[PDB]
Design a protein around this ligand. Structure first.
Ligand SMILES: Nc1ncnc2c1ncn2[C@@H]1O[C@H](COP(=O)(O)OP(=O)(O)OP(=O)(O)O)[C@@H](O)[C@H]1O
Ligand SMILES: Nc1ncnc2c1ncn2[C@@H]1O[C@H](COP(=O)(O)OP(=O)(O)OP(=O)(O)O)[C@@H](O)[C@H]1O
Ligand SMILES: Nc1ncnc2c1ncn2[C@@H]1O[C@H](COP(=O)(O)OP(=O)(O)OP(=O)(O)O)[C@@H](O)[C@H]1O
Ligand SMILES: CC(C)C[C@H](NC(=O)[C@H](Cc1ccccc1)NC(=O)c1cnccn1)B(O)O
Ligand SMILES: CC(C)C[C@H](NC(=O)[C@H](Cc1ccccc1)NC(=O)c1cnccn1)B(O)O
Ligand SMILES: Nc1ncnc2c1ncn2[C@@H]1O[C@H](COP(=O)(O)OP(=O)(O)O)[C@@H](O)[C@H]1O
Ligand SMILES: [Mg+2]
Lengths: 349, 192, 341, 192, 50, 51, 51, 50, 50, 50
């Protein structure tokens, strides 16, 4: 009946490389969501009701949080609304309200409410609604703390009255009543300063003998994470307890980033082979060069987004020269990635 | 010779940047005044967080016995686990403080020497033979208390400590690991 | 109809585990409210007895109020204070918590003049020092001053659609307000507690910081330091000390209630056709990890999703009978204890 | 005299301005208090950036062996490479610390002196012959460890270190580069 | 701005630019909008030199 | 499918970054907005928002 | 041209200070407003909360 | 605070929602308003002893 | 205070409101507004004595 | 100011065309708007003298 977590992860494996623990989660958690919807309309039969078990995705930038949700959008059979916490405010203030990410779920079910009661909202960048202190903020923080306060009625499940947002004021098209008790919330964020909070919790100092000082070659990082690390990051404790699952995205190593270049569906070197094909030029990467791009992308330190940053300071003299001439093959060698400003191998007609 | 970053604000020399990272430093001899300093720092770091480990660095030649047991008791008293690290030497009373760290958390640098020896009187204590009978029962009590302290922390019999501290026993870092004074010899962490 | 306060708590005991002092304070003040109504219908000008609940998160404040919803057959609004603004501003206005009452009263106004309006997260409407980028903080002091008239009890016009306005008297309407008040645990420790220093002084490790200081040590001057204006406290003379849950109650949350946690997961695995069992050592090993989280009974889900993460990936792709989650799977790394047919 | 200059509130001497540029300064003899200073500075600069290298200036007549191995092990412990520059002299322990820098990064000024010699005892250590044969096994432990330490770093055999440190082997900067204590005689960068 | 850079379904107010929660919006997709960004970065050449 | 490859353009003052963009405006066959990040403010706050 | 005189009530709390002034206002049925000075902030903005 | 204790023509907004349109304010003078202020003095008797 | 004390077309937010955008202001000219500023200037007695 | 001092298509945030509730912004090109700026720069004559 339902897509098993091995079948959900196998779909995610086609797009997302690496990220084994954060693909078991979001295949487990989507499968439990599918079992919550089947148990919500049928089934002694154990008269228990199931709580939603929301997800917080950690992990650094460019490492497949949004991309693992956009992949999860492609096979869900359930309404999905990717949403951004960097556009959300308190009620009363000028930005988008926290029930307009729930309008996006209703708009994802084309207008349907009963399907949107069974949906998934992905609130992206919830490390950006975190405070700058472990304490209550002196300012109001309408875009930060007050969003977390406004989201938590929706995260635990409520009779939310979604404004239709097509009139002059709010009750001009008769608020869409939605129940968010079965709406799964996969929230995500990079949580850049959270790694410093986790070392200060466990007793690891960052100075002296036997205390871990961190080099740039390393770029316990998001595992052994607790809610008290996220309270001290800036998430209020009411917000974190409504997010029981931590997906634990990790930094992509060199062996993952080599495969991110070549293997996925919209893979990165497939995009440039597509670009040079519009110039009538075949683009070839030697496999020593693909490892050299990913070797420089971990020094770049921006995830798989850094792979795109390397391949356009490598192919930049190529992409300038080649549309003004006539070639067949452009063999990217390993000698132009690690040794910058090297003209690669040409094969003309 | 020490760079102080002076300033109406905190001074911040490198020893403040040790103490803020919960590193108590014992690099002078263990007299009263240094023991007084260490116990004041051990209590302050307990009160700042009693769960985070206090690290104690030991580059000390050792010193007085009551100043030793002043530091020793305060190390054993505080709720924080004490991480002792030997720098260069932990001689005399300072080897006892090195063994007084929390088990698993007693460290030494590879070329740090650990010198254990029985208590001695600084100079000559004069007096009548009834005065000296008291002073000799005292240093025998200091000797027995040092041995049973090292018996608790090295896992050895106090009679084994007595035979070994009969003279100056200098242990290296690996020899103090085998003895029981430290738990790990610190490997070099250099990226070269 | 008037349920006795022992009978109010014994219904609360069927759902809420632990929180024994907060269940006495709710059951007495709910009983004192309806008995003062019934004696008034048949005085020494008695107190209003509105309830301010406050405790650690996940420990049951909302779940205490949702259990009072399922009992009294008196109209019970479940309104939130995270959408409340001042009048004449964007967002939900203060009089909508009266509209949520008559929606729960089926628009019968005389049963909504006896009902309970529960307001959730009044720690949101506490005063913050005003950010100079927001154009009139509308969510703090002004929401809270707009509650002052209806907490005591005034006539209030209620806009519908949440034509004519509905007049509700709130002199006999009980107000249970709640919030975790995360900074208030530090403010009380600034008054009744000391950072103990030295020999024989209580230093109070982080495991003992995770206790409650809201037991009898909360005062109105601590709530004003949080941001609550002093009149809003005076309309709340009853303070229900919601406490942190101990190890004994967190074990009993897992198996005993109606939608108990292990009953939620046994249902999740028998939809795969596989029994899920727990040793009693395992449920105690789940429950003592929730005290380290500080998220209350909500943290029991964070543990059991983490403990049962590899089997929920594995088990539906297999043919099994049962698996016995043991204490070697929360304390130690996950054994796969499954039993094949 | 040592002047200061106010930066921005803070009053910094040139030793602060050196230290903020990852430069540790060994300018006095290697006793406990100086070694304690250097080790504190080595751990602070490693915590600030364990990849940006630490520079150690050595104008020192050398000193105690346990204070030597305290600095030595800390120089080898830190993740940052140690750039040792000799300034005027590096005698005894200071020359061992000069050789203790990262290979390729051990410098000396052209008129710097590098003096290597075996460990000694300052003055007479009294005692019974059982005490003295332990103090002499100790000074042989210190001699062998120093010759092993100069064997790791000069690339020479420890028996050849032993024959050379029989007396004061005093090296110029060019002679210490051929020996292996430094790697670069640091040439002048004067514009004129 | 990072949601705008990477590509999102951004609701743009046609009011003039000042967001306010109620109106019809302009739905734009920025998954093909190029974002040249620039800046002087006056204190960065010291940071690079470190 | 292809992605954006956005540009972070760095350079000292008055050396032509805006003037590169103002020149690139004049040929572009593609709509072009000169924005300014100082004019922008986070959502919920006064000043312009990033939309 | 007479000028009013205001009362400063000293002393520690819980002695019945506000209950004196409230009873004294209930005697002459004049208005009575309890206010606190913690309702004013020690960061500025004071002048609109006095209103 | 001492401006109202001394007496001033103050313009009172009728509620928090009336700071939005800005044309209507409730006029009051405190020239005849009695002010009974009070404190929580427990560290003042030190100066009284002084 | 400089352009106020000498004279400028000053925009004045009304009672209750602040200087935020989309706020109506009052255009006053402070050219002929006399300013009598005053203070205790307690430290000035030392300075004139210097 | 630097976008204004060089020339930009700025839009004034209050009062676009005597306050219509739609389009409160009107465009202005500050490319040909001359800017004269001034100030004492009181500590600058100690800086120039260096
Ligand atoms: N595991 C992966 N496999 C394949 N491609 C990946 C993977 N992780 C990241 N990418 C690539 O990196 C790009 C950025 O991914 P994404 O949009 O998820 O950013 P992100 O890291 O979530 O950013 P943030 O953490 O700030 O939200 C995507 O276009 C995707 O192609
Ligand atoms: N004392 C309890 N007994 C039984 N179940 C409980 C208890 N406390 C919490 N739970 C369970 O955990 C859920 C969360 O508790 P609840 O909603 O009351 O938290 P809360 O205290 O309102 O949190 P917050 O302070 O963040 O608003 C409940 O719905 C219930 O399933
Ligand atoms: N390479 C160049 N060739 C011709 N003219 C130039 C060049 N660089 C700058 N200019 C001139 O300098 C003026 C300012 O250029 P621009 O507007 O790009 O400033 P900018 O340096 O980008 O300022 P900022 O760095 O602060 O954004 C332009 O009017 C242009 O005519
Ligand atoms: C062996 C351990 C316990 C301590 C060693 N010496 C002692 O026992 C010390 C001697 C000493 C040595 C150096 C500096 C100050 C005092 N003993 C005492 O403190 C002491 C004091 N009063 C009576 C008896 N012994 B260590 O300092 O060499
Ligand atoms: C050769 C290197 C390793 C060290 C040289 N100095 C030493 O050998 C020093 C000189 C010294 C100082 C005080 C007391 C006794 C001896 N040796 C020691 O540090 C020392 C200390 N205890 C026992 C044996 N040697 B040098 O002068 O730095
Ligand atoms: N001397 C007193 N006589 C009668 N009632 C008192 C007395 N002192 C305090 N109270 C009671 O205390 C309550 C509030 O006291 P209050 O006058 O506000 O003291 P304070 O001004 O110190 O806070 C009143 O409701 C009153 O009933
Ligand atoms: Mg709640």
């Amino acid at each position: 009946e339902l897509p098993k977590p091995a079948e959900i992860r196998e779909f995610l494996e086609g797009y997302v490389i690496g990220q084994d623990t954060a693909k078991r989660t979001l295949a487990v958690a989507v499968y439990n969501h599918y079992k919550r919807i089947q148990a919500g309309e049928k089934g002694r039969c154990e008269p228990v009701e199931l709580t939603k078990s929301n997800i917080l995705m950690l992990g650094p930038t460019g490492c497949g949080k949004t991309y693992l949700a956009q992949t999860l959008a492609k096979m869900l059979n359930v309404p999905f609304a990717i949403a951004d916490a960097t556009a959300l405010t308190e009620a009363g203030y000028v930005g988008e309200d926290v029930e307009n990410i729930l309008l996006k779920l209703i708009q994802a079910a084309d207008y349907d409410v009963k399907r949107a009661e069974t949906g998934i909202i992905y609130i992206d960048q919830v490390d950006k609604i975190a405070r700058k202190s472990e304490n209550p903020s002196i300012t109001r923080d309408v875009s930060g703390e007050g969003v977390q306060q406004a989201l938590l009625k929706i995260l635990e499940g409520t009779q939310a009255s979604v404004p239709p947002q097509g009139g002059r004021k709010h009750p001009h098209q008769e608020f869409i009543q939605i129940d968010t008790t079965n709406v799964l919330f996969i929230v995500a964020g990079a949580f850049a300063g959270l790694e410093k909070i986790i070392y200060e919790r466990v007793g690891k100092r960052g100075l002296g003998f036997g205390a871990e000082v961190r080099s740039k070659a390393e770029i316990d990082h998001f595992a052994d994470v607790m809610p008290e690390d996220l309270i001290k990051f800036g998430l209020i404790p009411e917000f974190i307890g409504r997010l029981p699952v931590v997906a634990s995205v990790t930094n992509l190593d060199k062996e993952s980033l080599v495969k991110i270049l070549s293997e996925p569906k919209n893979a990165l070197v497939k995009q440039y082979i597509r670009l040079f094909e519009m110039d009538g030029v075949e683009l070839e990467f030697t496999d020593d060069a693909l490892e050299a791009i990913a070797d420089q992308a971990i020094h770049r330190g921006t995830g798989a987004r850094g792979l795109r940053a390397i391949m356009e300071e490598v192919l930049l003299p190529v992409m300038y020269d080649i549309p003004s001439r006539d070639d067949v093959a452009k063999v990217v060698v390993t000698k132009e990635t690690v040794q910058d400003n090297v003209l690669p191998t040409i094969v003309p007609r | 010779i020490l760079p102080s970053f002076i300033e109406g604000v905190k001074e911040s020399n490198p020893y403040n940047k040790l103490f803020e990272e919960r590193i108590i430093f014992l690099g002078v001899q263990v007299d009263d005044a240094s023991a007084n300093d260490i116990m004041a720092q051990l209590l302050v770091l307990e009160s700042l967080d009693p769960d985070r480990d206090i690290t104690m660095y030991i580059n000390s030649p050792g010193g007085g016995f009551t100043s030793l047991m002043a530091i020793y008791d305060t190390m054993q008293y505080v709720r924080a686990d004490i991480q002792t690290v030997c720098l260069g030497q932990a001689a005399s009373a300072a080897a006892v403080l090195l063994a007084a760290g929390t088990p698993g958390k007693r460290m030494a640098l590879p070329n740090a020497r650990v010198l254990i020896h029985q208590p001695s009187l600084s100079g000559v204590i004069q007096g009548q033979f009834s005065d000296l009978e008291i002073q000799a029962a005292e240093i025998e009590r200091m000797r027995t208390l040092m041995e049973t302290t090292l018996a608790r922390h090295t896992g050895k019999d106090a009679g084994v400590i007595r035979k070994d501290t009969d003279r100056d026993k200098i242990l290296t870092a690996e020899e103090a690991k085998d003895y029981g004074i430290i738990d790990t010899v610190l490997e070099y962490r250099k990226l070269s």
